[PDB]
Amino acid sequence: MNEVGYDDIGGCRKQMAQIREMVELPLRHPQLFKAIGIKPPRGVLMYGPPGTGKTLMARAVANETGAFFFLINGPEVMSKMAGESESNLRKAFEEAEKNAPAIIFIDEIDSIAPKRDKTNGEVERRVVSQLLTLMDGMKARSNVVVIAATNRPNSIDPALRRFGRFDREVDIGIPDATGRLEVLRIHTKNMKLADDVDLEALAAETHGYVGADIASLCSEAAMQQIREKMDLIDLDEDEIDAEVLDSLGVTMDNFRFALGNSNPSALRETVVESVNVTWDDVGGLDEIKEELKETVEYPVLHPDQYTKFGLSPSKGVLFYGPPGTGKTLLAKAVATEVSANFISVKGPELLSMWYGESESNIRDIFDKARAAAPTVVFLDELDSIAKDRVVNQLLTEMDGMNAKKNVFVIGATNRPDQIDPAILRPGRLDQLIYVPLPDENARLSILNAQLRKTPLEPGLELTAIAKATQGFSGADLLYIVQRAAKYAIKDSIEAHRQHPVPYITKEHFAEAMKTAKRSVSDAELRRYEAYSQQMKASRGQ
Amino acid sequence: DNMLLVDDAINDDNSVIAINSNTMDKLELFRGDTVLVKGKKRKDTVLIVLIDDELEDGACRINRVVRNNLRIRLGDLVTIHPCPDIKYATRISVLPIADTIEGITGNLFDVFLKPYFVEAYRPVRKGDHFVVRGGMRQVEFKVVDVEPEEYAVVAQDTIIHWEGEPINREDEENNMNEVGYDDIGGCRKQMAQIREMVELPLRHPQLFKAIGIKPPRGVLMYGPPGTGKTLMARAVANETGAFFFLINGPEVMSKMAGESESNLRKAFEEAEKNAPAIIFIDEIDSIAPKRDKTNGEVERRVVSQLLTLMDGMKARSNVVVIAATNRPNSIDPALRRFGRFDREVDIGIPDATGRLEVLRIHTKNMKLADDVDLEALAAETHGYVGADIASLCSEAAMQQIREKMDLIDLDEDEIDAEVLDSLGVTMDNFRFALGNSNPSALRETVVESVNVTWDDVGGLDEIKEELKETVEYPVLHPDQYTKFGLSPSKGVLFYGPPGTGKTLLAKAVATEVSANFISVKGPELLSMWYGESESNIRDIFDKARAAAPTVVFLDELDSIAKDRVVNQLLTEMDGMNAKKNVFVIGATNRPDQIDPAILRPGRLDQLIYVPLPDENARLSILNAQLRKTPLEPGLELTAIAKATQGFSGADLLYIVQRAAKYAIKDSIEAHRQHPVPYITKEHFAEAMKTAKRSVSDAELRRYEAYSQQMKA
Amino acid sequence: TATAILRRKKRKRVVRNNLRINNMNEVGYDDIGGCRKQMAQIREMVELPLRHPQLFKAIGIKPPRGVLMYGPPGTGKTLMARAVANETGAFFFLINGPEVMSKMAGESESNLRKAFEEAEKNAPAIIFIDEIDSIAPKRDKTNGEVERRVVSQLLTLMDGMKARSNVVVIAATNRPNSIDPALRRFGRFDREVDIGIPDATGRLEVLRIHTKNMKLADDVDLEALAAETHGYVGADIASLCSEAAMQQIREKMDLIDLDEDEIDAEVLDSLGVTMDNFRFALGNSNPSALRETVVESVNVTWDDVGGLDEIKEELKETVEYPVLHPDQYTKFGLSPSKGVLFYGPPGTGKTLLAKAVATEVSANFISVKGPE
Ligand SMILES: Nc1ncnc2c1ncn2[C@@H]1O[C@H](COP(=O)(O)OP(=O)(O)OP(=O)(O)O)[C@@H](O)[C@H]1O
Ligand SMILES: Nc1ncnc2c1ncn2[C@@H]1O[C@H](COP(=O)(O)OP(=O)(O)OP(=O)(O)O)[C@@H](O)[C@H]1O
Numbered sequence A: 001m002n003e004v005g006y007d008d009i010g011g012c013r014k015q016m017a018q019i020r021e022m023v024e025l026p027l028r029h030p031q032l033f034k035a036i037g038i039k040p041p042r043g044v045l046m047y048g049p050p051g052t053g054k055t056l057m058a059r060a061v062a063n064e065t066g067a068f069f070f071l072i073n074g075p076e077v078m079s080k081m082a083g084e085s086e087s088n089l090r091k092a093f094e095e096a097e098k099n100a101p102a103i104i105f106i107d108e109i110d111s112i113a114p115k116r117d118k119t120n121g122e123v124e125r126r127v128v129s130q131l132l133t134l135m136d137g138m139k140a141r142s143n144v145v146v147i148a149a150t151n152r153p154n155s156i157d158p159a160l161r162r163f164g165r166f167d168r169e170v171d172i173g174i175p176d177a178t179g180r181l182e183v184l185r186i187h188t189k190n191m192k193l194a195d196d197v198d199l200e201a202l203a204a205e206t207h208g209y210v211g212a213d214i215a216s217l218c219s220e221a222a223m224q225q226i227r228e229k230m231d232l233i234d235l236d237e238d239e240i241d242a243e244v245l246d247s248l249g250v251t252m253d254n255f256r257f258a259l260g261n262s263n264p265s266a267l268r269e270t271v272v273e274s275v276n277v278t279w280d281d282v283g284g285l286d287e288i289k290e291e292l293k294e295t296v297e298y299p300v301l302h303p304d305q306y307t308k309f310g311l312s313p314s315k316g317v318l319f320y321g322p323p324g325t326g327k328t329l330l331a332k333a334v335a336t337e338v339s340a341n342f343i344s345v346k347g348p349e350l351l352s353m354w355y356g357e358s359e360s361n362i363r364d365i366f367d368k369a370r371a372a373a374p375t376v377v378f379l380d381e382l383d384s385i386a387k388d389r390v391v392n393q394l395l396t397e398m399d400g401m402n403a404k405k406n407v408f409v410i411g412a413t414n415r416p417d418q419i420d421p422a423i424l425r426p427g428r429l430d431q432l433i434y435v436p437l438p439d440e441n442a443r444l445s446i447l448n449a450q451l452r453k454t455p456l457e458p459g460l461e462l463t464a465i466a467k468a469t470q471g472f473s474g475a476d477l478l479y480i481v482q483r484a485a486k487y488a489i490k491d492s493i494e495a496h497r498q499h500p501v502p503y504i505t506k507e508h509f510a511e512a513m514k515t516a517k518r519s520v521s522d523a524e525l526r527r528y529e530a531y532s533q534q535m536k537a538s539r540g541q
Numbered sequence B: 001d002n003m004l005l006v007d008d009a010i011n012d013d014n015s016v017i018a019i020n021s022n023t024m025d026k027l028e029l030f031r032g033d034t035v036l037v038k039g040k041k042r043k044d045t046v047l048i049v050l051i052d053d054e055l056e057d058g059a060c061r062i063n064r065v066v067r068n069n070l071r072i073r074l075g076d077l078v079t080i081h082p083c084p085d086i087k088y089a090t091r092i093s094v095l096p097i098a099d100t101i102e103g104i105t106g107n108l109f110d111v112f113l114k115p116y117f118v119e120a121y122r123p124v125r126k127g128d129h130f131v132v133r134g135g136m137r138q139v140e141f142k143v144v145d146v147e148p149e150e151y152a153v154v155a156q157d158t159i160i161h162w163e164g165e166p167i168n169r170e171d172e173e174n175n176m177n178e179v180g181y182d183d184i185g186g187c188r189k190q191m192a193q194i195r196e197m198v199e200l201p202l203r204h205p206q207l208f209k210a211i212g213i214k215p216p217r218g219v220l221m222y223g224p225p226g227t228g229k230t231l232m233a234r235a236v237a238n239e240t241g242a243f244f245f246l247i248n249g250p251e252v253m254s255k256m257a258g259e260s261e262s263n264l265r266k267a268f269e270e271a272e273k274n275a276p277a278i279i280f281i282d283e284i285d286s287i288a289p290k291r292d293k294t295n296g297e298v299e300r301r302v303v304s305q306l307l308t309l310m311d312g313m314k315a316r317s318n319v320v321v322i323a324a325t326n327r328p329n330s331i332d333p334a335l336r337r338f339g340r341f342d343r344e345v346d347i348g349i350p351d352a353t354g355r356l357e358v359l360r361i362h363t364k365n366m367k368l369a370d371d372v373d374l375e376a377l378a379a380e381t382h383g384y385v386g387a388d389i390a391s392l393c394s395e396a397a398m399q400q401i402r403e404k405m406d407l408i409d410l411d412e413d414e415i416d417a418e419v420l421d422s423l424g425v426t427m428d429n430f431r432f433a434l435g436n437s438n439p440s441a442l443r444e445t446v447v448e449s450v451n452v453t454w455d456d457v458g459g460l461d462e463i464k465e466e467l468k469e470t471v472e473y474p475v476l477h478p479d480q481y482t483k484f485g486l487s488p489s490k491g492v493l494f495y496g497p498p499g500t501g502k503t504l505l506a507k508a509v510a511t512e513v514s515a516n517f518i519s520v521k522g523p524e525l526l527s528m529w530y531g532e533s534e535s536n537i538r539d540i541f542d543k544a545r546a547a548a549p550t551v552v553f554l555d556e557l558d559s560i561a562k563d564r565v566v567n568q569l570l571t572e573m574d575g576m577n578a579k580k581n582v583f584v585i586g587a588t589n590r591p592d593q594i595d596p597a598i599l600r601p602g603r604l605d606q607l608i609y610v611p612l613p614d615e616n617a618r619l620s621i622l623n624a625q626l627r628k629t630p631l632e633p634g635l636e637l638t639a640i641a642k643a644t645q646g647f648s649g650a651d652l653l654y655i656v657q658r659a660a661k662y663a664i665k666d667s668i669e670a671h672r673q674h675p676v677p678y679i680t681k682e683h684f685a686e687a688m689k690t691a692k693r694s695v696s697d698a699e700l701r702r703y704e705a706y707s708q709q710m711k712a
Numbered sequence C: 001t002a003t004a005i006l007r008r009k010k011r012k013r014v015v016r017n018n019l020r021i022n023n024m025n026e027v028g029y030d031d032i033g034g035c036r037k038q039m040a041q042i043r044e045m046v047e048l049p050l051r052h053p054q055l056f057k058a059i060g061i062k063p064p065r066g067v068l069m070y071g072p073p074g075t076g077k078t079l080m081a082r083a084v085a086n087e088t089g090a091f092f093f094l095i096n097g098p099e100v101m102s103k104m105a106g107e108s109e110s111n112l113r114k115a116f117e118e119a120e121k122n123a124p125a126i127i128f129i130d131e132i133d134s135i136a137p138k139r140d141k142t143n144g145e146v147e148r149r150v151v152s153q154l155l156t157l158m159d160g161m162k163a164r165s166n167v168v169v170i171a172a173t174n175r176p177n178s179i180d181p182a183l184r185r186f187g188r189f190d191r192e193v194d195i196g197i198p199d200a201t202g203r204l205e206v207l208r209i210h211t212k213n214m215k216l217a218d219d220v221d222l223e224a225l226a227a228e229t230h231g232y233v234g235a236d237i238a239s240l241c242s243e244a245a246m247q248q249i250r251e252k253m254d255l256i257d258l259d260e261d262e263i264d265a266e267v268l269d270s271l272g273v274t275m276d277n278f279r280f281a282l283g284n285s286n287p288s289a290l291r292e293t294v295v296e297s298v299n300v301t302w303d304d305v306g307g308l309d310e311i312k313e314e315l316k317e318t319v320e321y322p323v324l325h326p327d328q329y330t331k332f333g334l335s336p337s338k339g340v341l342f343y344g345p346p347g348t349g350k351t352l353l354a355k356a357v358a359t360e361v362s363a364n365f366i367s368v369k370g371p372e
């Protein structure tokens, strides 16, 4: 089937706009580049998690442009008899050239131009050389745009990423809540949905799902509805009752069951994501909030002042403090303020990179950060690695960056002494910041925020609980509220079984807090404070 | 009113079915009318209607030949419809069955068929059979071909062709696979999952048109070898009735370079042009293994061709691809994504009932002796896959033949018929076969089922209640959790003295929610650490996801919690959907020695101390263990329970086993002296004299001190 | 009934020679000794499916087809295979491993295909794939593409063979683990036989079989030679006899003039092997089976070890009763113990205790020294 217009896409305004401004104008309005006398870029390389719609984007752009389209699949081209792949490539390219304007989509290019390390096969070398020769010779040709789709940027051969080749790069990230809502609406434009559908609620619940996974979710929900209504349908009879066939209707419980039986995998690797956390779900640390605002917002939102004064913006920041203090939320808020993408790299990912068993690599992470700039790279629990190949690679990557690009590296840890002294030199993660435990007002704000999604008995003031939880990390308060909810649900289920309990009660909170604990021991807090004092004395003239 | 009872037809016509007069009235038929009868699976024919008053309402009479043709027995149910469009076969070719022409000479046509086709007008259909009594013998014939097709009537104008080779009766089943659902036992959930995704898109394709969705295409079954994956796929394909094409793995990977792609392409296009169809790719891993294994150009071009063909079919509908292998992490990962094997299915070793069903299915033709207690076999035979059960049956039969060999003479090529009629397999043969059997499914992690309740776990009632709260409520009442918007806890951890009853506790937890149970002992963890095992943590969690809900049990977690293994485990745990009911339960003896990283929230955080069994627990364990052993009447276990302070479950098991050993020693000594059917108290006294605590007080106090420190 | 088949020439002075009572093949069961149990197993698995197929029709089962023999090289695997094949008198197709592997690329699959097709056409048939390890080594051992084509072709032919066709496949390989794992599943080489080095009586039988034509001097004590030879495989015994004859002829060569092509008839008729020749041959010979772990019977009773009566009784209770009287254990439902661990000062005779335990239950003994 064809005619997949822009109306069949959602949640990808930025990348679609980039690809459109990069493809349409050279073909639709070549006279502009003649009037301004430049050479429009040819190569375009889209890469992102599998199933994000890269091929769908390419097809939509091709159809909307109304230009000759020629599809080349890496697998099928690599499946031909020896010496036939080169002939197929030469044909495809000549046919595209003769029918200008044209667009070429080399889908899964990584399968025909893999990393030079894994190109031991002679035929692989021949095919890669043929592709390189074809692309190099194409510069004479006009009105021909080549689009390549690959899983990761570090899998293709390095030789394919130079001027005159796939230079322009696009990074596809997982969609946000609005994107997921749009995907659901686009996919569920034909299903016989029931009245009680809350697509907004589904989008809120489903996190980390890519468009393909959402389509699978819709298919599974429809399958669940069919299975439920199968009791009124007999397999033996060839004919199907018209009314029963029409009576089919998808309900919310079907979608929840489909979510239960789903297997998302995009989050398994580092992926660019968008966040919308403001300075409202984070309480306290007002001085730190203001300092981070000054550090990040002004260089991004107000670059003219820095240009006037010649200041060089700080590259990265480092956070240290007791665990459970909300460093990740602070980083997300910082990313939100500058309205930039966010990349997260937990410690197990760093260990996997150290052992070289995960596909992704530090170089790939920073390449994706550059492609999706502005971004915010977040390195959690660095102390797990700064106990070094990985550290040296990270230092080289950090030193070799364009200061103008808005790439900020934010490191989190609990052992600032255990971090390598090299990482703290100027031009690197030198700006230290301590994250103290929440104060009474901070604890009250955290409790109130965490309870916005749970009914409460009227008059249940949390001030007493906040005051009775001095020195408690936010995670401990989350645990206390979770325990109270568990007690309440247990009581509700018991009452129902013996049969009431529509909301939590104060006595539930009292019982839950009767068995609470302080996550951080006093000795660790003393050492943290001692190190903070030591750092202050070194900058406290 | 097309459902009727089946009865034996007294008459001797292969194409006559009798119906009650009221039944005839309901269906609006006339005497002598020909009607089409469809039985089990896709077998159907046409028979001449007869009126018989003696027949009860909703009943019909059909001889054994019709029953064999329709794959039904006496009293079964069929669907009957009028067949007024039946024409007269102008030209029919039929050949006799080889076993029915044993010593028969002359013009078989005139001798047998001609009296059988003298204005008989017997309805015929492709592939049918009919027996005719000629002279003093009976000869069977088969409907090789008919014109016009398919169903017609043989009349005088018809031209009968009796020229052709004899039809051997063996190859109808030996060379052809016609196996229905009746040949599968011990796996019903898997069969339901496969059927609801194979039959529904094909038998009823209009439903998905009505609801406006594209049903999933690919399906990937996997499990231990010999679990019947091929048999299940064959049965589903035969029941569906669609054109079934098989693409064996080694068969396609054992041909000249550049021809394997041709075979794959031919198979796929042929299936495409005969929709609906089923394409079964047996042993997928043989042709598309993990990248690290295959490096030559041919074994990569084959994979590329397979991927291209698979991606090219999602447009066309009514075609589904079924694969098969033994591990999810034994094929190229590129095959597992949207549009390529969306659905995954895991097949595990059957439970006791499944093994009993398999034994019943296999041992339906053997000349079993009277003293057969297949229930006892099922109880004893644990970890045996269906193939191992077939091997057990074959070995038992071979042992029976060997025993009877004394009454046989190796010379000549025939045995006395009396000797053949005396072939009876007894229980001793089955026990010998069990002795010589070598099951190997358990050598690697597999999914099974458990049937342990809150009966074999004495004491620690509060622990039972806490486990119930943690596990059952999220699964049984997820609506309440949604109402409170709280995600259920993922995993739990148990710590305490060794041999205190943790494995059976995890089994009980899994049983309560009625979820499968995957076990991973310490040696498997070490083997995965050393990279000499065919399994991997990713594989374990993938199988757990496929068989969800499941309980993944990690025993002796301290041996490896001293790393790559811990990193992989942590990554798999974190990258787990919250809603999916995959609970990870760990056991250890050194809680401090366990890496702190695991004990963080969102992981194996909820710690539980398993205390040493007390007097009541000791009494319950003693009663449970002796549930299958005669005891001296009047024995009192209270004194033993009182005297067994500090003894864990393993210690009591050792005491009981030693007492039984002494009892059997005395029994055998008395027997040889030629009585001792019970275990006397003196046996237990001797065992106590030669038994002691397995845990020093130092370890107990250290564990209790650590528990108190955690409590504070 | 451990055998039940062995209890009762070669399908055949002039009359006796004709009735058999360089190509003298069709070696019968008489030409084998010291491997009675393995020969019984092979016969039970080969003859009955072919000679008397109606038994399995009557009882309603499919007889097993895959038989795989493995043991130390030189123990006579090919000898047993050929003996059984010729005795059964069925279409016998013989496939060598190295011979098939020596063909050009692409001509080593067609040979297997035609072999199996012919065996099917002329059923009943026996196919003996000698040295299967050469055409199906371990998966990691060989990565060559042809080495995978051949193995896959073999697997496809084997799986497709399973049918009513009366064709039995027999394979041999010195190392049980060398064969590809995929060849040892259901519908393939499932039944396995292990060949162990012979014992004293087996060695005597082999010696008598080989030393039946030599002009042995009347002063020969074959019993003494059988006793002395410990760990000698059949091939080693044949080499021993050949070397003894060589020594005898070398000693007699003094009277022989090599210049003359012929030799005096009287000297040629005076040849005779003496006991000292066998002693010298034993001195020269060198067995090789003991280099690797093998299976050999032992015949030590509770008389070559003194004392340890309490330990003897404990070992009896541990091992002997379950094997001899499993019925009572089944009655009581208590499974027997698996292993035991002897500890004590060195040289106390632990190995003798192990051998005595093995002999009491009439079970074969496997040994693994520390260096192994
Ligand atoms: N906005 C969207 N983003 C992502 N997927 C979408 C979107 N809208 C619809 N989809 C559906 O999601 C699935 C994406 O599959 P698609 O083949 O386009 O992804 P891909 O991983 O880029 O493909 P390829 O295999 O060609 O590299 C399709 O079902 C598409 O219909
Ligand atoms: N319910 C059952 N489950 C498992 N095996 C069964 C069952 N019923 C019968 N069997 C027998 O078990 C054996 C299963 O062999 P089968 O070839 O199906 O195994 P498999 O491991 O799926 O094969 P492969 O992967 O080689 O195609 C056959 O003997 C089959 O007859």
Ligand SMILES: Nc1ncnc2c1ncn2[C@@H]1O[C@H](COP(=O)(O)OP(=O)(O)OP(=O)(O)O)[C@@H](O)[C@H]1O
Pocket: C031, C032, C033, C034, C035, C072, C073, C074, C075, C076, C077, C078, C079, C080, C130, C131, C172, C206, C209, C233, C234, C235, C238
């Ligand atoms: N009972 C016996 N056991 C062992 N060897 C015997 C026996 N009787 C004779 N021999 C001799 O032992 C040698 C066995 O040779 P054979 O080729 O069978 O050995 P093999 O190592 O099993 O062979 P291969 O692996 O090459 O097929 C021959 O000399 C044979 O004559």
Ligand SMILES: Nc1ncnc2c1ncn2[C@@H]1O[C@H](COP(=O)(O)OP(=O)(O)O)[C@@H](O)[C@H]1O
Pocket: A281, A282, A283, A284, A322, A323, A324, A325, A326, A327, A328, A329, A412, A438, A446, A473, A474, A475, A476, A478
């Ligand atoms: N404003 C806040 N200040 C402190 N802790 C918070 C705040 N908001 C949430 N938290 C708690 O901290 C968690 C955020 O993760 P965080 O504590 O940063 O993890 P980590 O310390 O491992 O980086 C929340 O789940 C909650 O328990």
Ligand SMILES: Nc1ncnc2c1ncn2[C@@H]1O[C@H](COP(=O)(O)OP(=O)(O)O)[C@@H](O)[C@H]1O
Pocket: B456, B457, B458, B459, B498, B499, B500, B501, B502, B503, B504, B613, B617, B621, B625, B648, B649, B650, B653
């Ligand atoms: N509730 C129980 N607590 C302790 N032991 C028990 C209990 N119920 C039964 N047992 C017995 O205790 C023995 C100890 O072995 P097992 O339970 O496997 O210990 P572990 O799993 O702790 O290593 C079991 O064989 C079983 O017979």
Ligand SMILES: Nc1ncnc2c1ncn2[C@@H]1O[C@H](COP(=O)(O)OP(=O)(O)O)[C@@H](O)[C@H]1O
Pocket: C304, C305, C306, C307, C345, C346, C347, C348, C349, C350, C351, C352
């Ligand atoms: N009753 C016995 N106690 C100790 N040694 C014995 C006894 N009978 C024989 N031996 C001798 O013990 C030797 C075997 O040594 P062994 O105990 O196997 O060494 P190790 O203890 O290192 O295994 C033989 O040479 C044999 O002569």
